[PDB]
Design a protein around this nucleic acid. Structure first.
Ligand SMILES: C=C[C@]1(C)C[C@@H](OC(=O)CS[C@H]2C[C@H]3CC[C@@H](C2)N3C)[C@]2(C)[C@H](C)CC[C@]3(CCC(=O)[C@H]32)[C@@H](C)[C@@H]1O
Ligand SMILES: [K+]
Ligand SMILES: [K+]
Ligand SMILES: [K+]
Ligand SMILES: [K+]
Ligand SMILES: [K+]
Ligand SMILES: [K+]
Ligand SMILES: [K+]
Ligand SMILES: [K+]
Ligand SMILES: [K+]
Ligand SMILES: [K+]
Ligand SMILES: [K+]
Ligand SMILES: [K+]
Ligand SMILES: [K+]
Ligand SMILES: [K+]
Ligand SMILES: [K+]
Ligand SMILES: [K+]
Ligand SMILES: [K+]
Ligand SMILES: [K+]
Ligand SMILES: [K+]
Ligand SMILES: [K+]
Ligand SMILES: [Mg+2]
Ligand SMILES: [Mg+2]
Ligand SMILES: [Mg+2]
Ligand SMILES: [Mg+2]
Ligand SMILES: [Mg+2]
Ligand SMILES: [Mg+2]
Ligand SMILES: [Mg+2]
Ligand SMILES: [Mg+2]
Ligand SMILES: [Mg+2]
Ligand SMILES: [Mg+2]
Ligand SMILES: [Mg+2]
Ligand SMILES: [Mg+2]
Ligand SMILES: [Mg+2]
Ligand SMILES: [Mg+2]
Ligand SMILES: [Mg+2]
Ligand SMILES: [Mg+2]
Ligand SMILES: [Mg+2]
Ligand SMILES: [Mg+2]
Ligand SMILES: [Mg+2]
Ligand SMILES: [Mg+2]
Ligand SMILES: [Mg+2]
Ligand SMILES: [Mg+2]
Ligand SMILES: [Mg+2]
Ligand SMILES: [Mg+2]
Ligand SMILES: [Mg+2]
Ligand SMILES: [Mg+2]
Ligand SMILES: [Mg+2]
Ligand SMILES: [Mg+2]
Ligand SMILES: [Mg+2]
Ligand SMILES: [Mg+2]
Ligand SMILES: [Mg+2]
Ligand SMILES: [Mg+2]
Ligand SMILES: [Mg+2]
Ligand SMILES: [Mg+2]
Ligand SMILES: [Mg+2]
Ligand SMILES: [Mg+2]
Ligand SMILES: [Mg+2]
Ligand SMILES: [Mg+2]
Ligand SMILES: [Mg+2]
Ligand SMILES: [Mg+2]
Ligand SMILES: [Mg+2]
Ligand SMILES: [Mg+2]
Ligand SMILES: [Mg+2]
Ligand SMILES: [Mg+2]
Ligand SMILES: [Mg+2]
Ligand SMILES: [Mg+2]
Ligand SMILES: [Mg+2]
Ligand SMILES: [Mg+2]
Ligand SMILES: [Mg+2]
Ligand SMILES: [Mg+2]
Ligand SMILES: [Mg+2]
Ligand SMILES: [Mg+2]
Ligand SMILES: [Mg+2]
Ligand SMILES: [Mg+2]
Ligand SMILES: [Mg+2]
Ligand SMILES: [Mg+2]
Ligand SMILES: [Mg+2]
Ligand SMILES: [Mg+2]
Ligand SMILES: [Mg+2]
Ligand SMILES: [Mg+2]
Ligand SMILES: [Mg+2]
Ligand SMILES: [Mg+2]
Ligand SMILES: [Mg+2]
Ligand SMILES: [Mg+2]
Ligand SMILES: [Mg+2]
Ligand SMILES: [Mg+2]
Ligand SMILES: [Mg+2]
Ligand SMILES: [Mg+2]
Lengths: 114, 118, 208, 55, 123
RNA sequence: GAUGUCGGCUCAUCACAUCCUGGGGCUGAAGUAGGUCCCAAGGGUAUGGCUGUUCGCCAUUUAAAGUGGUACGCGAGCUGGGUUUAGAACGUCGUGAGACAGUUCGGUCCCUAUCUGCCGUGGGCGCUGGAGAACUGAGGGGGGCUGCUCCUAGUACGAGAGGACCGGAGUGGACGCAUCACUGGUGUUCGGGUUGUCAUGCCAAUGGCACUGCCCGGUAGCUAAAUGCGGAAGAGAUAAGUGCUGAAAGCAUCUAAGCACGAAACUUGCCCCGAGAUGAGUUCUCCCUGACCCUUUAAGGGUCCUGAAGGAACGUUGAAGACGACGACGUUGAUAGGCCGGGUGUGUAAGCGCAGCGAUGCGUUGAGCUAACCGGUACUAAUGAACCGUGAGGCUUAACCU
RNA sequence: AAUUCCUUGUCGGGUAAGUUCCGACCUGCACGAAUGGCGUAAUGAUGGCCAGGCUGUCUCCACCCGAGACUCAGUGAAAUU
RNA sequence: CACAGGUGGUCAGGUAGAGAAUACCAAGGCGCUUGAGAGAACUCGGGUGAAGGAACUAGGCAAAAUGGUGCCGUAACUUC
RNA sequence: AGCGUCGAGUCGGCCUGCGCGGAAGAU
RNA sequence: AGGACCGAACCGACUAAUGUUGAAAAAUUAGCGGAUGACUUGUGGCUGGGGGUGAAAGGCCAAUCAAACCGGGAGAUAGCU
């Protein structure tokens, strides 16, 4: 409890930017293709955030090369090098699962300009 | 299993329980002491004491939340004008349950539940 | 030997190379030796240890005198560990989680969570019968429990409904992720038996 | 499913070996009124732990 | 998480459009194929003049699943559809010359390095 | 004066004439891979298409898809497609009623478990003074499956083609145990959106009802599809088998004496139960060190005093639980509820102001509300007692001390 | 074939695989012309077969809400023997 | 049987609705003559469900699904 | 019999007593 | 216009589950068919047991039907238990 808090807090990233559901975010992930390591960008809409301390996660949805892809990132994972908000989205809901049933013009999110 | 679960079903559905405790909370605020079954008395604490807590801060919003949860403006008025003021310095424990034996008709364990400064 | 600890809960350790190791956090406070069993007196070699801190009112006079003989404070219980051919310990010696400093794998024993009275589907992984296709009142029921006149009885050990969990379980060969002697913590990879708060007996892995 | 043989009065008695009621071990005595009561319950005159709690 | 009767999209230009898993290979009572697993397929729908025909029985490697893949940090990658790449029944080598849509790094193996090379991205 | 029937489903259990995996002899056994026989029952031992099918054929798996017994195991466990009532029709037979072990369509499957058994779980008494703990381990149960890849090694073997033993490493399938950190499901106790309607005087705001009205999310818990772990190694004694030395029988001979190997079987090793193990075990600790009189002088009986350790009861309760039980706590107190702070979830409350003709938008505002969560906190309820349990614990013999 | 024993006839179609189904063939065990033959739009809680959708039917079950089951108080059966 | 059954006629409010359907209400009438707890298995009646989607089964049995109005549009075949 | 050597028995039919293998089953 | 269509009342009873010492000696629940007609329903009437009535199932004729029920022949007879 207080013990696990302490174990968790010392592993937590200190530099996680503010983002909300509906934001376009670019997540740069470490990819080890051999022993060489490089950053691979994954850009898309944040459809879900789990706020849970060290166990925090967020789900990013992109359309890649025809196909809808979702990636659930573990926020404090060392695999996630950096997160950056590319665009602020204006949505009502915490969870944008309704975007799974939308493509193109129907899947557009209004910008939150404030 | 019911590991870590709260709330008694009391051989009712959710809508009946909610309605019953709204009535019973109204009864306790109005009369300041009621006789009921010991399990109902224990559950009633979890309904009535938050209403008294809400009633410590008099505002339109809080009166409306109290009205939403009681549906009786006599009760809301008593909460905000009397009980909240009466309990302003007390940190919880606005009620006490006193066990008072067994009901004739069904041997139900009975208790009085009262406001502590009745 | 091993040590007695407490299941604090589960978390994860992120490794630098981006692995999340699921860990059970075990609080291993000082185990104080209350009795040393020997071959002459007791017929086997063991230590009895205590851990934690029981309140005086809950310590009976029999319990108090046992602790008082050892010259240790009352802990929340007593556990024995059998001694190896070499191992020697003294009464009143405190044994810390530093014991596990060089141990790679542990066996963790606890009391499993109690499921109460469990059906055969849950308890024994029995298959359900048809939900439809005419099934009459026999969806999760166990089916046949024997043959016929031969043998004309149900065999002992027949898998049937009954109490499930709330029993001693050992999980073997769990990797020791971290021994934190300063915080009295052992981190083991993966799940161990029992609820948060329950007593755990941790021993070096028997198998290897 | 039903018996093939009438169970005996003996067997009936044996089954009822666990049916005996337990008397109240002891009644508590109110410190003020002196009334006997179930422990942790109010007295018939409405005392509890010396205090007149009901009327 | 593909089983017998699961319909899959085809992530190649072999000519198949829709294929059905008729067997999860590689063990007795094996329930499911995830990404990187070889399945037996039948072609349910194909293009007119492709390398494969409707009703042909082949192997395929599952390259995308809705259930998705887990990574060592606890992350998940999920796709909107189940897709596979058709393989020669004997050689287990890709029939098509192109790969369509993302694949995962689970395919990174001498067996499927052709798929990796042809794929438009690897996640 | 009824022993329910084919097939399926559920759940099995045994045999071994062994399907796989293990050991081995012979081979017309180069290797690989077979053939055949011996040992071996530990564990394992397909999903589908068709058909009522069992079976079978077929498709595609698998290390393998064993063969049998068990009322052709299993309907007071399920099904009811088949068989086998009454309806109807076809072919066929019959003048006909009707009939067919020909076909066709339709066609009620009851039982609240007394006993045995079995799975769980208590109460009683016992175990010799009582009590609280920790144990020993007689005995019992669980578990025991296996693929593929790589290395050894393109080595041995082979004309090539191909391609090992032995040994080692990795990674899977199936199965099992645990767990909820993760990924998710659920989440009628949390938040929100919204339709119809009724109400709270009305507006505004709310509540009821409509499957939780319909929905969208979701906390804790429970949980699998989630993720940890397991099968072993080792040891003993062996099976078939292989031998050493070795006579009887100057030789030979694995055997008669003697000695050595030898398998998933056996006994252990691993896990769980376990002293009602009445053969009732051990260890540690704790508690009680009063008077008195009878008679049936005896493990006799009763009184007066005493009431221990500890237990139980009651109460607050629990990731313990059908009830019992088990665990925590009872003011010298965090046991539960409340309360405070936090987290989490939902997603910017109400009110007010502003913009708009208005729906509505914007600001105040990531607001308000927030269960089972976390950290705290005696506000409420856990009572002073009372109750049970006693007062040094039999005889005999030995060994020691007096 | 509501008729075909042999029979899952044979050939074609559909399926990865089809004793059923559809189309044929004719070798009609044992069709056949008002105890009607062969067709036939429409109709059918009619029989058979296929497909899309759909799903806890199933892989393989999980959780939840209620009514019982369980405990307490009151009342109080039954078959059978 | 104070029994979820059966029993002809008459009357016909509001909001929504095509409606005497249906939902919510009015007038009016009722909460069904054992209750109290608990929150096991299992049964019953329901809700939701990852991935798959008939692999279930004698058989898609059951369930899930479809579902309104206006307009557009609509095949073989046909006794038109 | 083993290798002329070697110094005591050896060889295998018959009849018969008792044993041995042949000999795998399901709670 | 219609033994027309969709659909309540009304009439019915195709499927499933429940129930099977039932709430009920045939129902309940969810679905289902007909619903201006060869429809349905109230009241009364007529048909009588080898008889009736039957859009025909040996259906129905008072929870009884290959010959109702009640009383009688009657203590039928019973080489059977
Ligand atoms: C009625 C007897 C049944 C239930 C069934 C019986 O099967 C027959 O007798 C076949 S004849 C068939 C029986 C039932 C009753 C009338 C009709 C004809 N059908 C529906 C059957 C299968 C046997 C052949 C004869 C013995 C049985 C006991 C054991 C068994 O297997 C039974 C009898 C004693 C049993 O009571
Ligand atoms: K068998
Ligand atoms: K061999
Ligand atoms: K075996
Ligand atoms: K039989
Ligand atoms: K059967
Ligand atoms: K029986
Ligand atoms: K039954
Ligand atoms: K018996
Ligand atoms: K979880
Ligand atoms: K959850
Ligand atoms: K409303
Ligand atoms: K004992
Ligand atoms: K128990
Ligand atoms: K508290
Ligand atoms: K606002
Ligand atoms: K506001
Ligand atoms: K918030
Ligand atoms: K014929
Ligand atoms: K005729
Ligand atoms: K007659
Ligand atoms: Mg709680
Ligand atoms: Mg009740
Ligand atoms: Mg409601
Ligand atoms: Mg439990
Ligand atoms: Mg099944
Ligand atoms: Mg039934
Ligand atoms: Mg059922
Ligand atoms: Mg017997
Ligand atoms: Mg008998
Ligand atoms: Mg009893
Ligand atoms: Mg009999
Ligand atoms: Mg054998
Ligand atoms: Mg054996
Ligand atoms: Mg063994
Ligand atoms: Mg088969
Ligand atoms: Mg049988
Ligand atoms: Mg069998
Ligand atoms: Mg039955
Ligand atoms: Mg039976
Ligand atoms: Mg039938
Ligand atoms: Mg007939
Ligand atoms: Mg075993
Ligand atoms: Mg598994
Ligand atoms: Mg958690
Ligand atoms: Mg979720
Ligand atoms: Mg929900
Ligand atoms: Mg709500
Ligand atoms: Mg309004
Ligand atoms: Mg109302
Ligand atoms: Mg209403
Ligand atoms: Mg020799
Ligand atoms: Mg093995
Ligand atoms: Mg938030
Ligand atoms: Mg609101
Ligand atoms: Mg803002
Ligand atoms: Mg708060
Ligand atoms: Mg035929
Ligand atoms: Mg044919
Ligand atoms: Mg054909
Ligand atoms: Mg099919
Ligand atoms: Mg034909
Ligand atoms: Mg004819
Ligand atoms: Mg004619
Ligand atoms: Mg005709
Ligand atoms: Mg009544
Ligand atoms: Mg009635
Ligand atoms: Mg009527
Ligand atoms: Mg109505
Ligand atoms: Mg329930
Ligand atoms: Mg549903
Ligand atoms: Mg699903
Ligand atoms: Mg889904
Ligand atoms: Mg589909
Ligand atoms: Mg099928
Ligand atoms: Mg099948
Ligand atoms: Mg249906
Ligand atoms: Mg439905
Ligand atoms: Mg012999
Ligand atoms: Mg009509
Ligand atoms: Mg009729
Ligand atoms: Mg109906
Ligand atoms: Mg019609
Ligand atoms: Mg109609
Ligand atoms: Mg007839
Ligand atoms: Mg009749
Ligand atoms: Mg007659
Ligand atoms: Mg006469
Ligand atoms: Mg007579």
């Amino acid at each position: 409890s207080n013990i696990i808090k302490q174990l968790e807090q010392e592993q937590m990233k200190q530099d996680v930017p503010s983002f909300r559901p509906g934001d376009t975010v670019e997540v740069k992930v470490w990819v080890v293709e051999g022993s060489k390591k490089r950053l691979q960008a994954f850009e898309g809409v944040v459809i879900a955030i789990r706020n849970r301390g060290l166990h925090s996660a967020f789900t990013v949805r992109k359309i890649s090369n025809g196909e809808g892809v979702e990636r659930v990132f573990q926020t404090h994972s060392p695999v996630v090098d950096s997160i950056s908000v590319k665009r602020r989205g204006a949505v009502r809901k915490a969870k944008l699962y309704y975007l799974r049933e939308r493509t193109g013009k129907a899947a557009r999110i209004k910008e939150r300009l404030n | 299993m019911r590991h870590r679960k709260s709330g008694r079903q009391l051989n009712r559905n959710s809508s009946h329980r909610q309605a019953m405790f709204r009535n019973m909370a109204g009864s306790l605020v109005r009369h300041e002491i009621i006789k009921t079954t010991l399990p109902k008395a224990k559950e009633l604490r979890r309904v009535v004491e938050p209403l008294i807590t809400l009633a410590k801060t008099d505002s339109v919003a809080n009166r409306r939340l109290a009205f939403a949860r009681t549906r009786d403006n006599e009760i809301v008025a008593k909460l905000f004008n009397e009980l909240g003021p009466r309990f302003a310095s007390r940190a919880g424990g606005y009620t006490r349950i006193l066990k008072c034996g067994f009901r004739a008709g069904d041997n139900a364990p009975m208790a009085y539940i009262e406001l502590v400064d009745r | 030997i091993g040590l007695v600890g407490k299941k604090v809960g589960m978390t994860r350790i992120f490794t630098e190379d981006g692995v999340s190791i699921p860990v059970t956090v075990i609080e291993v406070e000082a185990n104080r030796v209350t009795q040393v069993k020997d071959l002459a007196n007791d017929g086997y070699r063991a230590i009895q240890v205590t851990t934690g801190a029981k309140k005086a009112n809950r310590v009976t006079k029999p319990e108090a005198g046992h602790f008082a003989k050892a010259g240790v404070e009352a802990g929340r219980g007593l556990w024995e560990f059998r001694l190896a051919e070499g191992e020697e310990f003294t009464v009143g010696q405190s044994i810390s989680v530093e014991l596990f400093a060089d141990v790679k794998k542990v066996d963790v024993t606890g009391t499993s969570k109690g499921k109460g009275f469990a059906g055969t589907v849950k308890r024994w992984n029995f298959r359900t019968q048809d939900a439809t296709h005419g099934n009459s009142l026999s969806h999760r029921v166990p089916g046949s429990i024997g043959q016929n006149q031969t043998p004309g009885k149900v065999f002992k050990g027949k898998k049937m409904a009954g109490q499930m969990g709330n029993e001693r379980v050992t999980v073997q060969s769990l990797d020791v992720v971290r021994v934190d002697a300063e915080r009295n913590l052992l981190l083991v990879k993966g799940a161990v038996p029992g609820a948060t708060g329950s007593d755990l007996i941790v021993k070096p892995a028997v198998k290897a | 499913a039903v018996q093939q043989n009438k169970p005996t009065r003996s067997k009936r008695g044996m089954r009822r070996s666990h049916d005996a009621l337990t008397a109240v071990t002891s009644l508590s005595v109110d410190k003020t009124s002196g009334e006997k009561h179930l422990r942790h319950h109010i007295t018939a005159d409405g005392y509890y732990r010396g205090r007149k709690v009901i009327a | 998480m593909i089983q017998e009767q699961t319909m899959l999209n085809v992530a190649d230009n072999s000519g198949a459009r829709r294929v059905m898993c008729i067997k999860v290979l590689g063990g007795s009572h094996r329930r499911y194929a995830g990404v990187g697993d070889i399945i037996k397929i039948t072609i349910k729908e194909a293009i007119p003049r492709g390398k494969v025909k409707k009703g042909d029985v082949l192997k395929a490697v599952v390259v995308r699943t809705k259930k998705g893949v887990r990574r060592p940090d606890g992350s998940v990658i999920r796709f909107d559809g189940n897709a596979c790449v058709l393989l020669n029944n004997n050689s287990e080598q890709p029939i098509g010359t192109r790969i369509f849509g993302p694949v995962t790094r689970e395919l990174r193996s001498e067996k499927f390095m052709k798929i990796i090379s042809l794929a438009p991205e690897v996640l």
